[PDB]
Point group: D2
């Protein structure tokens, strides 16, 4: 009888934040992996002490050896640099191989950028079902779209439904049309004077650039509280079979007119992985932005294939 | 400084459930009031024991005296008769007239001991008893509401989630109007994380007749459970619904929730409590949302408010 | 890939309260079993609706057929009457058999009274390891001892350690000597004037009679919020391998001078069940009260053996 | 009505961690202050995003201005220099003199903008900087404390639990005195759900040398982590420790926690802040617990308070 095992491939800012979350939520034993010697082990000691304050029994361990990931139920990958593409492609290939050897039945959540591109390399090097490999981005872009909308309307973000599909990047595709307040079309709140069409346009673009906005303010580093919470919600939805509807980068085999690619779309995450891809009724205009956003992904996936 | 004070008027199965939720969530001190001597004191002692299992400091007290609700930040009222005996004459010469008179003494005790409290009614005919409680207490209309939509919507949402095999958390579903057979669920506003439910009809997750049956099963959900229970009524979802409202107030969460609130022109209703989607915050019912209802939906709604009007008229007669 | 399954044998007051807890805590899917037709099914509908308010995906089902318990990870038993002994012994025998057929790898928590007696009958009829069958009582008696102490000192019960060993009943054995405030001997707070020796004596006896006190106040029925929370903490400690130190009725094979009996003593509950029995340094006076408390249990276990 | 206001003075790794804990636990509105321009504003925006993942309404703001702490119900202070550079001369002519002067401006801003707030210090030499902050702010001594014991005890407890293979929740372990090498962990008061740890020595769960090593590893825990990290210090357990104290106040939990508090005769200490087991409640440090320390333990303690005295004397000189 075994506790769920959650391995974080990469013990940087996002990685360590995800470990704290896993410990605060007693999701499972946490393994922080990193190539930098000692550092993960030091974060793990800090986190282990934090459990005494949370009155939990969570085992958190740091390591520099991939062998410690054997039997992981969930793996979340932030390892990489933020000529970056061939480097990260090399690392993700190495991560994918180690996963296939040590924990091939794991559910795998990629975060390393360019997200959608690196997701497919991971799957290819890993060989696991396309159903149990995915990338976090849409949940993050959605949480920002949701937050910005929620702030202007002055309602809880819980009651704001918003989504971002396509690729993680400046050409991500926020969908103002599908935004709702507890299922009420956002258009209704324009008519009632809660928000104007211009402010929605601005929030849509602010959602597109939100990462850069944080990066500019932080001065040194990118966002990580929300990136981490996003990947952990995906991990929570898998481990507790919550069947949550979330935008994630997932393998498509015809939906939205894409084949053999990981792209950001709404899915149902459950105990078996990405159990259902949801096919939105995009308008022509929305399909086009989606097709332009994933252009870069198609080409880079094809370029990196050529270079192996 | 002081912890928030939550008083539960009526210590039946719902009241005890709400107290257990409040202790579990460490929302504040809890006061269990009831007319039955000693019983509230027994439930408080049981719950006090449980805070040890929950490693919480929550104070839970039982009492047969209104003086102990002094300074309640939130009052939640389950006292009175229930629909269970429904005897077609029960609604008319028992439930309605008796509960109205209890709502008055309850309102007077609130006005005397905790006039600054947010008041959440549950006793039925809810939309009516909320009016009575409000008038008897003289409290601001936005600080007195009724729980019904949250519960009706919790069922509407559950049935929807169950068929689609997604979490109820991404099913947005609302029930507006009056609590009871006149309630108006809104299939057209149901969404799966903002996606209209129509999209899942066409993509085969759901048929519209199933949606129509779910609308009806939502209307009859209480009676379905009662008939199954043999004794009593549902109390778990009624309790969590009222506490979610109470939590939205105590923590200023600005949650969108269908609640029985005072309309002052919205939806064409004037000076009357009825179920509408509202924002609950630290200052109570802070905003009524006026949905762009179709005429069909608005007719359904107006008919729902008319039956509410009749019963407040009949009660105002005596 | 499967969600934890928790079956409640008995859907009465305690049983239903335990189901709510399981749903509030997303511990697993809950199966409420009862011999009374429809009633459990009705409580389950009520609880299923409660999940929409808690924004969870917990599946809660009611049933009148034992076949629905197959594959349960945890079973908690309240079925019975509150000539009661031969009746409950018959029921517990039936429960135990059904468990052995349908879910023999389950962790089993008994609550039906006389607790310690009914625990052994269950194990005998069930055949499962003595390690994965136990009874809840000490956690409940301890939570009352802890609460009463905490009230007089005006500290959080979290910071009060107190224990009750022996049999569930009027001769339960509260241990004032081992009571601590965050590990500080309670004796120290006598010397400082926080509590007197007489008040401790009174709390010890009030702990002994606490069930009856509630029963007298409730007028109709016995306690159940705390009984339920107690059994669920034991269940939580097993399902999440929390390794919690708790007084429970557990099989002894020499510890405390008892063999082939379930008695209330401190144990470590983990993912493998009752992983460790803790052997307190009882004084002679404490050993004696322990021996007198379990006298009734020894005899009734022997009497019921004779009658099979 | 208003949500509780929590201001974090210093938005480093600890401060950001505390803000994430406060948002996760919906304890109140959060104000991240720092001297670094824009950085607090960046962390607040990241955290604001996260409330969407947590389905919470928590307001998190970043600021480089003290005026925005107006009305804080709790202030938690991490600003200043850290031990990381420790350069044997760092403690004496940098850490001590520089942090004292920041604690004064921090204290003055508190006195002007939120004098009714519960103040939790973290900056080191903690026991000393707590005195400075208190004197500079003029706040009641029981409304200004320092976090150290909780963290030191969280480590003491973890190491103990780990060896015994039980949950840290049933290991009661306390560290008293000053934070730093002079801290005094108390192996004699350690218990496993009230059972003296001596009982587990004899029954073979633990050896006393292991207990002695764990006492030492507890003293050196910070430096152990720093040496492993390469860059920086621990921040996860420091953060949860201060928030547990802040939670005990905001929710009047009456938790027993070793905290750096003002002694007025207890333990033989007069007019001085040091680490003692205390009760934290809605009114702050409500009661100091005077343990029946053995002479050996009391000598250890007095030596710990003397080093604290020296550094407050040296700082008071200038």
């Amino acid at each position: 009888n075994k506790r769920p095992k959650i391995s974080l491939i990469g013990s940087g800012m996002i990685g360590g934040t995800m470990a704290y979350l896993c410990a605060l939520k007693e999701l499972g034993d946490v393994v922080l992996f990193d190539v930098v010697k000692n550092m993960p082990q030091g974060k793990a000691l800090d986190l282990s002490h934090s459990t005494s304050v949370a009155d939990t029994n969570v085992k958190v361990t740091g390591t520099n050896s991939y062998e410690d990931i054997k039997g992981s139920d969930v793996v979340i990958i932030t390892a990489g640099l933020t000529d970056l593409l061939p480097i990260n492609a090399k690392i993700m290939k190495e991560v994918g191989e180690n996963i296939k050897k040590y924990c091939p039945n794991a559910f795998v959540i990629c975060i390393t950028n360019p997200l959608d591109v690196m997701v497919k390399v991971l799957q290819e090097a890993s060989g696991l079902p396309h159903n149990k490999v995915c990338g976090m981005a849409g949940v993050l872009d959605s949480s920002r779209f949701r937050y910005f909308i929620a702030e202007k309307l002055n309602v809880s973000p819980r009651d704001v439904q918003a989504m971002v599909i396509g690729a993680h990047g400046d050409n991500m595709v926020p969908l103002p049309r599908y935004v709702t307040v507890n299922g009420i079309p956002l258009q209704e709140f324009i008519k009632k004077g809660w928000i104007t069409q211009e402010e929605i346009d601005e929030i849509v673009e602010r959602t597109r650039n939100a990462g850069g906005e944080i990066v500019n303010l932080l001065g040194t580093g990118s966002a990580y509280f929300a990136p981490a919470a996003s990947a952990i919600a995906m991990a929570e939805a898998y481990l507790k079979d919550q069947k949550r509807v979330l935008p994630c980068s997932c393998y498509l085999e015809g939906q939205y007119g894409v084949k053999d690619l990981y792209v950001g779309v709404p899915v149902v995450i459950g105990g078996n992985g990405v159990e259902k891809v949801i096919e939105l009724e995009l308008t022509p205009e929305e399909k086009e932005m989606f097709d332009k956003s994933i252009e870069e992904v198609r080409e880079l996936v094809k370029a990196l294939e050529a270079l192996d």
